């Protein structure tokens, strides 16, 4: 099944073969993103888990849209 | 037996295909809009258009485009009917006489197969080296223009893709080469290819592109500074360039399909483009200058325009 | 000076006039035939007026109207001017929504335009329009009864909306255009057939709407039912509905009694003085007949893929019954009977052609097979079909059938006389070696019969949009079509210029 | 060591694996949305309702746009009725083996197990005049397009096909001894050729010589039921399921084999090659498709070459129907007669369909071959 597909490196998951050709495109798709998007998500996680002081000082580094 | 008689009351109005260019003067904008079998010679005038002379042919004009070839000052025009007969236009003025003169033409066709499914398509390579026809779904039938041709010649070169959606060509890379929508039995990709004229053969394409967006409709090529190929879908926009990618997905168009396009700039800085219920949007490109001769894309722009009629 | 030209305009001496209507210089033929001499598409061909005779003009100087002027006659003066000059003058009354049909009452002053708009499906309320078309604002607004479907549970949930389709019943104003009263079907119910006419001894004059109920995802339909209508004192009424197991698709009048075509099943209708229909007869040996024309007793069937279908009715046996059929299978398009002998149809491939009824009723076998007797190539689609001119009636051809198209190219279908036949057809092969079309195409090539499968040559018909092109060539290139030809005044004498370019003016009074 | 700058990449590409039909060059994420790439939705497709497809080709194109042809034959190839019954009651018992229609339709010709053919009005229901043929029975029975000519074929006799004539004169015109099974050409019918076991020899009609006799012993797929058979371009020849050109007489590409019996037709467009259920190419031999439903089974198709049908030769003969769609091959209906098919005609103006069913159980004693006519597209 490995040979007449796209050639797996003898990984054991999915043995279709239309579920094999699509584990041919999202392997190897070229996934990118915007940094901003997870520096809130850096920020959300610091007020929550009791050590918000540092919430403030991330107004000089980037943008701080909310609160 | 019984013997009738028909005549024309009304001439036709709906429009199918308008071309601009220079097709009367040299240095002189006009419009060109055929409708049914009427050619309508319009001129652009800074008050609006004025015609010239209207021409009707034997045949729906559904396919036409100017192109001025090598070693003429103005331009052709090339007009397919609906019966396969081609035909090559060229406009001849002197004083009050004002003539159309066919220089070369020929019924093209073959005897067996399915004509299409989607109408016929016909673009121009850019560098008037070749005339695209799509016209028996697995044949590419390609016109090789020479002025060796008084008659036209016809080369059937095969596509091994036989249910193509879109077909345009691309900008001046030395060769002239092809761009495709083509439906897979599993997936749907674009693929491009090369085709050497004097070997009647396909060579091997410089894109490959296995995987596109599932409503791929129309490709919009961009010209020579920063060539490549938009590919517009249903619900998202890209842009390719062999190495580089670009993708955007605006919530502007969500409720329409794109239609129709133009390159407004001559260096392919905006676009206009409509839709099947009237709008009208602009594509903004932001060209960026990387190097001192080095040119790219960056960013793009999609800006409401407001309502029109159906384009 | 160069050579004369006799044009008649009528009996009594002709007065000829330059004036100034806004600007441009327009120029009036005072005639017994009044007609504009100034521009025809920036051309020579003359232009009429809505009046009957016009003697003398006289530039006054009203105050309600610029620049006018005023016709002193043998009647009323009338200060008036003259717009943009052609030959169609054309008339915009814009709705903003997808107009299907139309129909006219003579005893009402007031039209019927079914309709089509386009929505979607709102998450809390039922539908939500798009933009403000002329069907919401209306002077009179009214939704249909007696939900007579609701046995079916077919009506299942959908997700978006995903543009489903909305249809209502525009009786448009006689004069002011304006949109009298707006009628929304039910849900997903199309508008297919419309009419308009007298059914039995009621005196009533009626709209007739047939109806069909569609769901995508689905086959063709086996729903719908038919509805007819009354504008008693500029009110809609629902008289009276008929529940029918299948799609209608066209409805005409037969002698008051009604005629439909309902999924290959050509049902023909009765009126009762109870505000009832009942089914008198049937038929069964269709494919999908989808178009229905009739002239005294004889019915002409479309069928879908095979053709041409004559039907008979016979009033004493009060059945219909199979004279013939034709068996070439073409895609029909539209159809429409000339004179109860020869039927025109249409086609998808863009083409013409008559069956004629067969004569030789020598057996029965041949009784029964009609003849396609005659070809051409339109190379127009074609919707519509229907009598009456566009000319005056000053009481040549005879009869006249205009056809409705997609590209809003508008012709002019009439019979010839077989002499003229003869005279007509040799003269289209004179100009075939003279007129150098653009293309280098050959006019009996394109008007060739050409479907996927026949490429026969076309027969019968006339194409006078080549014959009216003789009057635009000069008299040097008019003396060679002029060869050694006929004429018919029984008689026979040999053609000439002066006299064939009356017969093409002959045609030209008509277009 | 792993960072943010691998785990939310490898967060949103499992995330992306929810995706049908998913994207390459993707736009860029929302990390508060979900992420959805674009499914396939149609605006340029007629819809699946007929009367939505009668709305909308009155102010567009022919059909009602795109794939808005094929769904008029999803409605119009599904349904059949019986016309009429033709019995042969001479001997008060049918015995018909092979059925075809004229050039223009108006007799059909039938083919007994005594040797003689028998025309039939299509609108009488009267026998004509039957015609002493062949001693054997009677296998394969075709006329041309012009109305010129006609061959008919014997099982054992010792002239084994008849190249008579129809338009005066009843006369084999040729004769052929040695082939079991002969077809008229296509495009120019000037040529007929034969085939007796698995050797093909091209003929004329003027002058009945061998013009060109392919076989290769080299390549030979070597069936059971050898059909030699034209493109309608009249340029390859199927021998044994191997291409011919006719033109310098050499073999081009040989096709594997599968099911022991049939050797190859081809499909109306010209650009296939069908052997029993493997959709071939013309220009570089690859596959296409591969239909179940294609065991062991003869095709026909329209005139046009837009609806294919099948019969099955299992021992029953033609449990049922089946026909098939010529572009997609997307199966349209499977109606079902009760009794045992045999023979299986349609006309070139497309509305019958001479059927040579079998009476009666499986019984090699008793075989009652009446004959039906169908109507094409009608409840």
């Given at each position: ?10 990984i ?33 996680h ?22 | ?83 396969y ?5 060229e ?16 019924n ?6 399915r ?43 095969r ?45 091997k ?13 129309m ?19 890209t842009?390719?360039?062999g ?66 009629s159906?384009? | ?32 035939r ?45 200060i ?13 009354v ?31 309320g ?38 489903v ?5 525009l ?32 005196p ?10 569609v ?47 309902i ?41 879908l893929?095979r ?16 004279i ?65 001119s ?62 996927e ?12 949009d ?26 026979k ?9 009356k ?9 | ?19 049908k ?38 102010s567009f ?43 223009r339709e ?134 044994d ?27 109306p467009?010209?650009?296939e ?18 239909v ?59 509305c ?17 071959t009446?004959?039906?006519?169908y ?5």
């Amino acid at each position: 099944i490995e040979r007449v597909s796209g050639k797996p490196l003898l990984i054991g998951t999915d043995v279709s073969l239309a579920r094999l050709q699509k584990a041919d495109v999202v392997a190897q798709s070229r996934i990118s993103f915007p940094e901003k998007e997870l520096l809130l998500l850096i920020r959300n996680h610091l007020i929550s888990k009791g050590l918000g002081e540092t919430a403030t000082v991330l107004t000089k580094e980037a943008d701080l849209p909310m609160t | 037996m019984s013997y009738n008689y028909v005549v024309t009351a009304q001439k036709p109005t709906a429009v199918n295909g308008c071309v601009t260019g220079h097709f009367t003067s040299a240095e002189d904008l006009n419009l060109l809009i055929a409708k049914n079998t009427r050619l309508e010679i319009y001129v652009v005038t800074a008050e609006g258009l004025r015609p010239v002379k209207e021409v009707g042919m034997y045949g729906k004009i559904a396919v036409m485009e100017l192109f001025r070839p090598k070693g003429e000052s103005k331009d052709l025009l090339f007009i397919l009917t609906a019966k396969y007969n081609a035909c090559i236009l060229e406009y001849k003025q002197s004083g009050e006489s004002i003539d159309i003169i066919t220089r070369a033409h020929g019924n093209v066709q073959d005897r067996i197969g399915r004509p299409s499914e989607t109408g016929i398509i016909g673009i121009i390579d850019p560098e008037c080296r070749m005339i695209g026809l799509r016209l028996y779904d697995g044949l590419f039938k390609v016109i090789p223009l020479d002025r060796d041709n008084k008659e036209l010649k016809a080369f059937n070169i095969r596509l091994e893709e036989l249910h193509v959606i879109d077909v345009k060509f691309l900008y001046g890379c030395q060769a002239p080469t092809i761009c495709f929508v083509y439906q897979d039995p599993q997936g749907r990709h674009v693929k491009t290819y090369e085709v050497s004229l004097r070997e009647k053969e396909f060579n091997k394409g410089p894109w490959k592109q296995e995987n596109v967006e599932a409503e791929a409709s129309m490709v919009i090529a961009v010209p020579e500074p920063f060539g490549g190929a938009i590919i517009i879908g249903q619900e998202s926009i890209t842009y390719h360039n062999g190495d580089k990618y670009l993708a955007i997905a605006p919530p502007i168009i969500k409720q329409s399909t794109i239609v129709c396009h133009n390159r407004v700039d001559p260096n392919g800085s905006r676009y206009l483009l409509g839709d099947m219920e009237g709008r009208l949007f602009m594509l903004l490109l932001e060209k960026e200058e990387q190097m001192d001769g080095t040119v790219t894309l960056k960013d793009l722009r999609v800006e409401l325009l407001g309502e029109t009629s159906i384009a | 000076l160069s050579d004369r030209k006799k044009v008649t305009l009528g009996t009594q001496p002709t007065v000829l006039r330059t004036f100034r209507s806004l600007s441009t210089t327009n120029v009036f033929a005072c005639s017994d035939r009044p007609t504009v001499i100034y521009s025809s598409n920036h051309k020579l061909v003359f232009s009429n007026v809505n009046l009957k005779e016009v003697n003398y003009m006289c530039p006054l100087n009203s105050d309600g109207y610029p620049d006018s002027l005023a016709l002193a006659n043998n009647s009323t003066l009338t200060i008036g001017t003259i717009d943009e000059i052609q030959k169609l003058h054309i008339r915009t009354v814009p709705l903003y929504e997808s107009p299907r049909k139309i129909c006219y009452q003579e005893v009402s002053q007031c039209f019927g335009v079914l309709s089509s708009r386009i929505e979607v499906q709102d998450t809390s309320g039922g539908t939500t329009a798009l933009r403000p078309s002329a069907s919401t604002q209306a002077l009179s607004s009214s939704v249909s009864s007696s939900k007579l479907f609701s046995s079916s549970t077919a009506p299942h949930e959908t997700s978006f909306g995903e543009e489903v389709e909305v249809h209502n019943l525009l009786i448009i104003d006689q004069h002011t255009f304006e949109v009298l009263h707006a009628h929304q079907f039910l849900q997903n119910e199309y508008a297919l057939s419309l009419v308009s006419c007298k059914l039995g001894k009621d005196p009533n004059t009626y709209f007739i709407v047939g109806t069909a109920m569609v769901y995508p995802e689905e086959a063709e339909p086996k729903q719908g039912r038919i509805v007819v209508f009354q504008y008693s004192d500029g009110k809609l009424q629902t008289v009276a509905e008929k529940e029918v197991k299948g799609a209608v698709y066209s409805m005409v009048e037969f002698n008051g009694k009604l005629l439909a075509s309902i999924n290959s099943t050509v049902r023909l209708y009765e009126w009762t003085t109870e505000k009832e229909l009942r089914t008198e007869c049937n038929h069964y040996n269709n494919i999908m007949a989808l178009y229905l024309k009739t002239k005294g007793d004889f019915i002409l069937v479309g069928d879908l893929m095979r053709s041409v279908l004559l039907l008979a009715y016979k009033p004493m046996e009060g059945n219909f019954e199979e004279i013939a059929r034709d068996f070439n299978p073409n895609w029909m398009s539209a159809v429409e009977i000339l004179d109860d002998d020869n039927f025109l149809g249409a086609e998808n491939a863009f083409n013409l052609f008559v069956c004629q009824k067969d004569s030789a009723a020598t057996t029965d076998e041949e009784r029964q097979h009609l003849q396609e007797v005659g070809l051409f190539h339109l190379g127009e689609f074609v919707n519509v079909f229907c009598h009456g001119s566009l000319v005056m009636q000053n009481l040549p051809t005879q009869g006249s059938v205009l056809f409705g198209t997609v590209n809003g190219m508008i012709g002019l279908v009439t019979s010839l006389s077989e002499s003229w036949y003869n005279l007509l057809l040799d003269m289209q092969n004179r100009l075939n070696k003279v007129i150098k079309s653009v293309g280098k195409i050959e006019h009996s090539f394109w008007r060739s019969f050409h479907t996927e499968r026949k490429t026969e040559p076309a027969t019968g018909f006339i194409d006078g949009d080549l014959i009216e092109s003789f009057l635009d060539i000069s008299r040097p290139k008019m003396q060679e079509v002029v060869a050694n030809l006929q004429y018919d005044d029984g008689m026979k004498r040999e053609a000439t210029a002066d006299d064939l370019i009356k017969v093409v003016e002959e045609l030209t009074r008509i277009h | 060591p792993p960072t943010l700058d691998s785990i939310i990449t490898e967060y949103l590409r499992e995330q992306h694996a929810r995706c049908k039909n998913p994207v390459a060059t993707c736009p860029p994420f929302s990390l508060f949305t979900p992420h959805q790439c674009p499914e396939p939705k149609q605006r340029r497709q007629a819809p699946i309702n007929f009367t939505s497809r009668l709305n909308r080709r009155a102010s567009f194109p022919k059909y009602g746009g795109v794939d808005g042809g094929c769904f008029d034959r999803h409605l119009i190839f599904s349904r059949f009725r019986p016309i009429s019954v033709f019995r042969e009651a001479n001997e008060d018992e049918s015995g018909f083996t092979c059925c075809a229609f004229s050039a223009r339709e108006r007799f059909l010709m039938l083919g007994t197990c005594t040797g003689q053919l028998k025309l039939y009005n299509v609108f009488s229901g009267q026998e004509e005049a039957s015609y002493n043929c062949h001693n054997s029975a009677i296998t394969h029975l075709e006329p041309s397009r012009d109305g010129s000519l006609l061959l008919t074929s014997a099982t054992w006799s010792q002239p084994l096909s008849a190249l008579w004539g129809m338009k005066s004169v009843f006369d084999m015109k040729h004769s052929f001894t040695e082939d079991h099974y002969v077809e008229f050409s296509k495009h120019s019918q000037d040529r007929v050729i034969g085939t007796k076991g698995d050797i093909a020899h091209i003929y004329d009609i003027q002058t009945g010589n061998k013009l060109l006799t392919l076989f290769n012993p080299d390549l030979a797929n070597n069936y059971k039921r050898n059909c030699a058979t034209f493109n309608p371009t009249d340029d390859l020849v199927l021998n044994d399921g191997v291409l011919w050109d006719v033109r310098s007489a050499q073999a081009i590409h040989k096709f594997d084999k599968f099911n022991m019996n049939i050797s190859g037709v081809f499909h109306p467009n010209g650009l296939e090659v069908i052997i029993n259920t493997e959709i071939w190419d013309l220009r570089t031999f690859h596959l296409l498709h591969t239909v179940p439903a294609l065991d062991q089974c003869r095709v026909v198709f329209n005139h046009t070459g837009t609806v294919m049908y099948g019969a099955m030769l299992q021992s029953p003969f033609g449990s049922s129907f089946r026909t098939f769609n010529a572009t997609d091959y997307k199966p349209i209906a499977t109606i079902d007669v009760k009794r045992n098919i045999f023979d299986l005609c349609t006309d070139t103006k497309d509305c019958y369909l001479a059927v040579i069913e079998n009476q009666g159980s499986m019984d090699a004693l008793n075989m009652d071959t009446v004959c039906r006519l169908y109507e094409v597209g009608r409840q």
